[PDB]
PDB file of C-alpha atoms in Angstrom:
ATOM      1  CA  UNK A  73       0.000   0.000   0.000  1.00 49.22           C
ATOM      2  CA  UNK A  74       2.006   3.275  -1.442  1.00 46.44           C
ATOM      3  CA  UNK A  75       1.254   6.835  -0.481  1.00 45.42           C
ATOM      4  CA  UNK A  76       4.132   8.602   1.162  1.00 46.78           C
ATOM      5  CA  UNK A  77       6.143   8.004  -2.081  1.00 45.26           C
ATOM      6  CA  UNK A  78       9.236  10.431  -2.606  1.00 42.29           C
ATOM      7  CA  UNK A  79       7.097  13.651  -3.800  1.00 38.67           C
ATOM      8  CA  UNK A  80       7.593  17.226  -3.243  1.00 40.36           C
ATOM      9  CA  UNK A  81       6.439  17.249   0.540  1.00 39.59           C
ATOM     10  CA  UNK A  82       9.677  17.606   2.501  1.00 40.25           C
ATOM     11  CA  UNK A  83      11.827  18.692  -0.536  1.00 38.87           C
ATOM     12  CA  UNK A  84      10.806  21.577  -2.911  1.00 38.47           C
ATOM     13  CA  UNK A  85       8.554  22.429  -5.641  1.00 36.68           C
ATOM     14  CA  UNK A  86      10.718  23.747  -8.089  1.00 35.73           C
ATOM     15  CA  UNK A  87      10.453  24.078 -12.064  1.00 35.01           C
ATOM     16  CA  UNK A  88       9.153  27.757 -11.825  1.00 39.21           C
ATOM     17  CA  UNK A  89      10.800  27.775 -15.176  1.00 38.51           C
ATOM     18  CA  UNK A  90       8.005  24.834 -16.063  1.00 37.91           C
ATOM     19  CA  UNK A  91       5.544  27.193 -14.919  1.00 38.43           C
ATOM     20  CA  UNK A  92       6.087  30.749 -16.535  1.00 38.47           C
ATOM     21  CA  UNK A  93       5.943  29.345 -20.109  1.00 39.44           C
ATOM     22  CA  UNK A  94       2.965  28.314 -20.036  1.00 42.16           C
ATOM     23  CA  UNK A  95       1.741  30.845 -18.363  1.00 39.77           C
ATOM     24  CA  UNK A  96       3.347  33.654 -21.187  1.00 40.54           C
ATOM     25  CA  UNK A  97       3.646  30.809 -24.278  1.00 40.56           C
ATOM     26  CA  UNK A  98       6.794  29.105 -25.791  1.00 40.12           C
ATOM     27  CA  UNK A  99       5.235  28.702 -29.388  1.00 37.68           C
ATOM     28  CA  UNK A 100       9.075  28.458 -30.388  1.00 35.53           C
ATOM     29  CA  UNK A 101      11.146  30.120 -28.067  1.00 37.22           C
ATOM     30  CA  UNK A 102      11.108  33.799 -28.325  1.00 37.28           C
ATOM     31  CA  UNK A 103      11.983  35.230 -24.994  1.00 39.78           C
ATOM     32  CA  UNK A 104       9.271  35.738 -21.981  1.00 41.25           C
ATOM     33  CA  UNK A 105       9.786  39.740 -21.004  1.00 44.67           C
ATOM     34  CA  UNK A 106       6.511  41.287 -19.641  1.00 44.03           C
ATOM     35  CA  UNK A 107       5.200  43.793 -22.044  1.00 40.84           C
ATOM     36  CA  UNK A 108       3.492  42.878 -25.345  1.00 44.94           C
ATOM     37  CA  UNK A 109       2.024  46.270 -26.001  1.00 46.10           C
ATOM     38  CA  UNK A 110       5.432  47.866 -25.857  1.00 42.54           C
ATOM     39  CA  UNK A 111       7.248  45.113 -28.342  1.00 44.25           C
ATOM     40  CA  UNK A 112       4.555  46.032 -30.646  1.00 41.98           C
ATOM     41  CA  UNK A 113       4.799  49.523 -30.184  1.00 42.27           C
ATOM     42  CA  UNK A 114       8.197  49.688 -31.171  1.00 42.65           C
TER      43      UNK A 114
END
């Protein structure tokens, strides 16, 4: 009977970097800066 397997409980969450892209989008790798409008605008 498993349960208390060797997950992220006592350890760490990590892969914030696993998070962000899909939170922004990675459609092919094109840096993740915060501010579409201004990229466009210029």
């Amino acid at each position: 009977a498993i349960g208390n397997m060797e997950q992220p409980h006592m350890d760490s969450r990590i892969g914030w970097l696993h998070n962000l892209g899909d939170q922004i989008g990675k459609p092919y790798n094109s840096s993740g800066l915060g501010g579409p409008s201004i990229k466009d605008k210029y």
